[PDB]
Structure formats: structure tokens, C-alpha cells
Design a protein around this ligand. Sequence first.
Ligand SMILES: [Cu+2]
Length: 129
Amino acid sequence: AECSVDIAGNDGMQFDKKEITVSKSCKQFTVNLKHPGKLAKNVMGHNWVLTKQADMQGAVNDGMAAGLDNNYVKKDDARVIAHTKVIGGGETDSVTFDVSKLAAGEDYAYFCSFPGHFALMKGVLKLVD
Ligand SMILES: [Cu+2]
């Protein structure tokens, strides 16, 4: 079991994975977000943001308000455990977080906070083993 995962966000506004499972054998965990497909960042940009299940809609709505040049994430938003940049067709971005910021027993939502993308691009991350 690895301590990283690859996840693609595409032009039909979908992520290919709905569940990321973080092993407790990991001290650090990496998410590599790649955007296959040909649309530009300005129309079909994607990021991957990690928040606790209950904090998600708050993070999305304040993110919307933050803008592309903030990667649609409120700066220093306490709720966001980890997040990539907004990338467009043909890019990749990666984020690494301490598995120690996660509590087993808690459930986590990962989503794209690019405007209105959260409705399809959303999933759960959970601590495993
Ligand atoms: Cu998106």
C-alpha cells in the first residue's frame, strides 16, 4: 500500500476516483491531481481540496469568493487541511500532507472548489487499516 494517489479531473466535470483511502502506515500522504483533456483553466479548472465532512459547503462558498488567483480557496482558511492549485488541461499539481492531521473516526470530503464544480466533483477520504 502506497502513500500517494493519482486523481484526474476531466472536461466532463468529473473526478475519476470517488474515494481516497489513506493508510495509517503513512506519515505523509501525496495526492497528484492531473487534468487530462483540453480545456483551459479559466473554463474547466480543477483543484482538489480536503476538509472535514461538515466544513465542506463553508469552504466551497468562501472559496468561490476567493478567485482563481487564490486557487478558489480562502487564504489561511482553517478548515482546509490540504489543497492543490487550480490547473487546466494538460497540467498536474501535487499536495503532500501529514496523515497526523487526520483523525480515524472522522470522515473527510475532498472536492473541487472551482465555481459550481463541487456538485459533481466530490468524494471521501478516510483513514484505513
Ligand atoms: Cu473543477
